[PDB]
Ligand binder design. Structure first.
Ligand SMILES: [Mg+2]
Ligand SMILES: [Mg+2]
Ligand SMILES: [Mg+2]
Ligand SMILES: [Mg+2]
Ligand SMILES: [Mg+2]
Ligand SMILES: [Mg+2]
Ligand SMILES: [Mg+2]
Ligand SMILES: [Mg+2]
Ligand SMILES: [Mg+2]
Ligand SMILES: [Mg+2]
Ligand SMILES: [Mg+2]
Ligand SMILES: [Mg+2]
Ligand SMILES: [Mg+2]
Ligand SMILES: [Mg+2]
Ligand SMILES: [Mg+2]
Ligand SMILES: [Mg+2]
Ligand SMILES: [Mg+2]
Ligand SMILES: [Mg+2]
Ligand SMILES: [Mg+2]
Ligand SMILES: [Mg+2]
Ligand SMILES: [Mg+2]
Ligand SMILES: [Mg+2]
Ligand SMILES: [Mg+2]
Ligand SMILES: [Mg+2]
Ligand SMILES: [Mg+2]
Ligand SMILES: [Mg+2]
Ligand SMILES: [Mg+2]
Ligand SMILES: [Mg+2]
Ligand SMILES: [Mg+2]
Ligand SMILES: [Mg+2]
Ligand SMILES: [Mg+2]
Ligand SMILES: [Mg+2]
Ligand SMILES: [Mg+2]
Lengths: 177, 104, 136, 74, 53, 61
RNA sequence: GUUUGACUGGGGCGGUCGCCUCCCAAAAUGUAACGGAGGCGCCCAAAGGUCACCUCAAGACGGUUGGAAAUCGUCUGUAGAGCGCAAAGGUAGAAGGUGGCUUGACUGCGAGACUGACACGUCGAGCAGGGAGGAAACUCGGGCUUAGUGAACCGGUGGUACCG
RNA sequence: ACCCCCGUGCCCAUAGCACUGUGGAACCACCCCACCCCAUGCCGAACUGGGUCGUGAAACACAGCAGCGCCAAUGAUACUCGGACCGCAGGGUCCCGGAAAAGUCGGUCAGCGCGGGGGU
């Protein structure tokens, strides 16, 4: 269930190279944020509950349905009822999912060279380039409604984008080559 | 967030009560509970987990709660008082209350 | 000239010129000596007048501008309310305020081009040069 | 149009330096304009009133720092 | 205070009997679930009976 | 231009700017202006000082 | 046999009568015009009581049938938001956003004051009978306040038991 | 008494921000794990609870610094109570005290307590 792999080798690699005042000054990962917008799904009272089971069965953590705020949007925004779903993964439950995806889920994408290496968050944080929802191991074309996808954000303690992609090594870090 | 405390500290209208203020402050596994004169710019009777390790398990607040209770009762001065902070009730903080309240 | 959406109405009062400078945006400029209203036209004709005497060049600057709406009798009497929304728009100017300014033309060049625009103006005026330099 | 309505009478009833009784009204204003200080209460309509007889005094620096308070005499 | 065919209503209270009244304004807007509340009559205190009609 | 410094014996009583280089649409900015003896620019370097304005043009009726 | 309103830069036609907010209003309050703008004749059994926690608008970067606008992420963020409605005041230690439990949107009074020619109208400490939330100091006799109203007469219903 | 730390006031930006330098077994903080107390309308991130090592990184604390903010004179002016006036009018003047806003000269990166822990 990992968490050992972050320990030892990941830390000194950047610490014995670029240097750090501490093992605490070493870049970390606080939380993996997973949110699937259901806005494209107008099913609402019918099938909105289905996407909750999708995210709950994969991360073993119940999703919280987000809300409208009702906005305007000039085409569709209304009141209220959910408009999307949300789950935050931190600690070992982040480390159960994160390891599960990089070893298993990521190779399941067709012609996968890895996510865009260009600057994501100058503050050091990182996203996921997930397009399809079917690419995940638990999801298959066997059981689905339609073809959709969800977004995932890696929240890291990296102080720089330079040191961001640096920590982002180890864990399954493909590139543009 | 840092308005957690200042929601409570202002929640008690101080000199309008006629009472005194008892500030319990937790940082480490140690707690310092001190009682302050609101009207005047001063404090009255201190306590601490500092010279302590009375109990091993925090809930050693029982001692410092009773320590204040006794240290204050020498000055007289027992009504209600009782400030609090960003910290909730029950648990470790109520081990302090019942050590003072009913213990003082 | 007449502008986009507003508060729509006004009364009247008069002080002395507040936000008009001595100089700006050019060598020579025009300054009003009497408290008054200037309309959407007038200054519109003043631009046309001045520019006609130039090469048509875009060297002219108009610091003034109509804001204040004025009203009029629909037909007559006192029957009914206050009325007359669009009658004309005016711009109040107070003495010492600088009205127009020109660029790059010579001395007599802008002397005569101010003089032509001197008429068409309800007030007496005098042109100028720069000594006081204020930008902040 | 012609539809404006009523006077509403909001003011500062007892100005600083004055000797209030118990129950007198110190200020009538709209929402918060003056904050109730020592010895001063506040009602539904806001509108500070006197909790204890004595001398009324005004305290402010800036903003919403305005305060009305009482103190006794003897 | 004015009354018509419309939504909400004026509804009286129960028997705190005592044969007693309260009558707060009410509404059928939320629900027709009726109602019961707590009040005090001549007899005792807090005898809590049901909104009538 | 406000500039500054150093000697107020030698103060820059004027500023010489050569315009023969520029023709039409050319905006000469404040970083192009010559200020000897280390007189730091008061305003932004890219602020426009001299710009030659194009000939009067019209098309539609 | 009678009725058939007034205002009104003559009367009529048209419009207008009560209530709340801003301007006029001349830095106290008050102040008119067939002056300049806009709203009310409700809603809320929870939008109330209390008890806890929560913090907004907007932009930039990066992200998935989702692009002006979505949902997520980080950064900025004295408020540029919100407060059921109309504006002004007011609000970040919140009145605004969320839950726990609730019936004080109580009976009996009412120190002393705001305001009115009157009649109305507004605020209110505190006392008792009883409760409600809290561990507690405490708060609660509707709502951020300011509109959501009708003297008396005559009468319907439930009490009460004074007259008879 | 002095240095300093933790708490808590008064003041209620001349005490605020960013750039930044010191600080670490004494104090703060993160960190550590948590089936249950307790608790996140998802996540113990937040509350909460069990405790070291580590770390001085983050947050905090103090010293630095006057680029930004915030305070900001004296001079003069605007306006004006009162007095006395010119213009057909828009408007304007004289005397008399009162006297701003902005701007410049500058001034700053605070002050003042109560209690307890730790060095000298
Ligand atoms: Mg006038
Ligand atoms: Mg100016
Ligand atoms: Mg009024
Ligand atoms: Mg101040
Ligand atoms: Mg008539
Ligand atoms: Mg008529
Ligand atoms: Mg008549
Ligand atoms: Mg009309
Ligand atoms: Mg007035
Ligand atoms: Mg007046
Ligand atoms: Mg009159
Ligand atoms: Mg009128
Ligand atoms: Mg008018
Ligand atoms: Mg609140
Ligand atoms: Mg209880
Ligand atoms: Mg009461
Ligand atoms: Mg009867
Ligand atoms: Mg401290
Ligand atoms: Mg040491
Ligand atoms: Mg943790
Ligand atoms: Mg820092
Ligand atoms: Mg002076
Ligand atoms: Mg003058
Ligand atoms: Mg005079
Ligand atoms: Mg005369
Ligand atoms: Mg004058
Ligand atoms: Mg005088
Ligand atoms: Mg004078
Ligand atoms: Mg003076
Ligand atoms: Mg000034
Ligand atoms: Mg300066
Ligand atoms: Mg400093
Ligand atoms: Mg000390």
């Amino acid at each position: 269930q990992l968490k050992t792999k972050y320990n030892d080798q990941v830390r000194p690699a950047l610490m014995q190279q670029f240097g750090y005042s501490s093992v605490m000054a070493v870049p970390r990962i606080e939380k993996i944020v997973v949110n699937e917008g259901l806005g494209s799904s107008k099913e609402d009272s019918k099938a909105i509950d289905k996407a909750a089971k999708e995210l709950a069965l994969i991360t073993l953590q119940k999703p919280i349905i987000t809300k409208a705020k009702k906005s305007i949007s000039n085409f569709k925004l209304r009141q209220g009822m959910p408009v999307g779903i949300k789950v935050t993964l931190r600690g070992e439950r982040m480390y159960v999912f994160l390891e599960k995806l990089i070893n298993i889920g990521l190779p399941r994408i067709r012609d996968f060279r890895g996510i865009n290496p260009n600057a994501f968050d100058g503050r050091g944080n990182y996203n996921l380039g997930i397009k399809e929802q079917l690419i995940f191991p638990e999801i298959t074309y066997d059981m689905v409604d339609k073809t959709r996808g969800m977004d995932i954000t890696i929240v890291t303690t990296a102080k720089t984008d330079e040191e961001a992609r640096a920590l982002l090594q180890s864990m399954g870090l493909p590139f543009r080559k | 967030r840092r308005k957690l405390r200042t929601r409570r500290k202002v929640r008690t209208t101080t000199a309008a009560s006629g009472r005194l203020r008892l500030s319990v402050y937790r940082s480490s596994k140690h707690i310092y509970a001190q009682i302050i004169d609101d009207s005047r710019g001063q404090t009255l009777a201190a306590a601490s987990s500092a010279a302590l390790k009375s109990g091993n398990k925090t809930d050693t607040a029982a001692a410092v709660g009773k320590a204040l209770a006794a240290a204050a009762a020498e000055k007289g001065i027992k009504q209600v008082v009782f400030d609090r902070g960003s910290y909730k009730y029950h648990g470790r903080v109520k081990a302090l209350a019942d050590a003072a309240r009913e213990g003082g | 000239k007449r502008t986009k959406f507003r508060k729509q109405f006004r009364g009247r009062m008069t002080g002395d010129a507040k936000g008009g400078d001595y100089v700006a945006f050019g060598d020579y400029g025009l300054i009003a000596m009497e408290p008054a209203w200037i309309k959407s036209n007038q200054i519109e004709a003043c631009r046309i007048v001045m520019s006609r005497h130039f090469r048509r060049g875009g060297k002219i600057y108009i610091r003034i501008f109509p804001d204040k709406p004025v009203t009029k009798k629909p037909a007559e009497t006192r029957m009914g309310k206050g009325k007359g929304a669009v009658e004309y728009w005016v711009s109040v100017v107070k003495p010492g305020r600088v009205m127009f300014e020109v660029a790059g033309v010579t001395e007599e060049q802008a002397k005569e081009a101010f003089r032509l625009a001197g008429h068409k103006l309800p007030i007496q005026t005098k042109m100028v040069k720069r000594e006081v330099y204020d930008e902040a | 149009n012609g539809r404006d309505s009523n006077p509403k009478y909001l003011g500062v009833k007892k100005f600083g330096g004055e000797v209030v009784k118990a129950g007198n009204i110190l200020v009538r204003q709209r929402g918060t304009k003056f904050k109730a200080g020592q010895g001063v209460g506040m009602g539904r309509d806001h509108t500070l009133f006197a909790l204890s007889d004595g001398k009324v005094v005004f305290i402010n620096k800036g903003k919403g720092a305005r305060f009305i308070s009482i103190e006794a005499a003897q | 205070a004015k009354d018509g065919p419309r939504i909400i209503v004026k509804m009286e209270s129960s028997a705190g009997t005592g044969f007693y009244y309260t009558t707060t304004k009410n509404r059928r807007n939320t629900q027709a679930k009726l109602e019961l509340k707590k009040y005090d009559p001549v007899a005792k205190k807090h005898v809590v009976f049901r909104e009538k009609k | 231009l406000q500039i500054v410094a150093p000697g107020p014996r030698r103060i820059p009583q004027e500023l010489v700017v050569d315009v023969t280089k520029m023709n039409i649409g050319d905006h000469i900015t404040a970083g192009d202006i010559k200020l000897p003896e280390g007189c730091t620019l008061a305003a932004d370097p890219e602020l426009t000082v001299v710009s030659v304005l194009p000939p009067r043009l019209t098309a539609e009726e």
